[PDB]
Amino acid sequence: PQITLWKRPLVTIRIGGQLKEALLNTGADDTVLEEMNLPGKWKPKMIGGIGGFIKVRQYDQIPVEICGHKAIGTVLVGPTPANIIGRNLLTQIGCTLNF
Amino acid sequence: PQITLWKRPLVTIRIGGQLKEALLNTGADDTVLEEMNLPGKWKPKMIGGIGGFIKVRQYDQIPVEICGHKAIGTVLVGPTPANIIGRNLLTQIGCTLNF
């Protein structure tokens, strides 16, 4: 679908069998979700944001359905202010910016 | 134009008489530019995201051209690790997300 930007680009996603709301973020290299449990192994990682750096847990090859579109990739979990869908998964569902 | 997300969506913008490289950022409503000495009055403001909050200067009614597309609105200037073009200006140039 085509999404305008007058309002936040919020969408419903499915991960680990649970539904959640996330923000389509073209300004994010990765997909970062608020604290939650995810099956499998994870590795410690550090990422940067507008206010500085934080520590997160990196889960690889995780299935994520975004607005009915399937993606399987890296998902970071940590103290993010909101669940965000970054470029790593946006590219998987064929999302582009247009003007 | 159509910008894919394989890499950070960087574009050239014109502001305060300068040409800069900025990232189209659907994850923010505000537009934040790296420290620059813009003339005019401003108001203090605090913005937050991953890592916490930073202090910036808010300038209003500032003309900003994005890839030849004219816009005008609020621009925040401060110690951001990157020039960010938010939804406030993205809507002005008719930018959408499509998949």
């Binding site: 940067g48 993010t80 965000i84 | 950070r8 505000d30 913005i47 995201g49 990157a82």
Partner: peptide, 8 residues
């Protein structure tokens, strides 16, 4: 290194 810019 990874950069992510959501703003609240």
């Amino acid at each position: 290194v990874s950069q992510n810019y959501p703003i609240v």
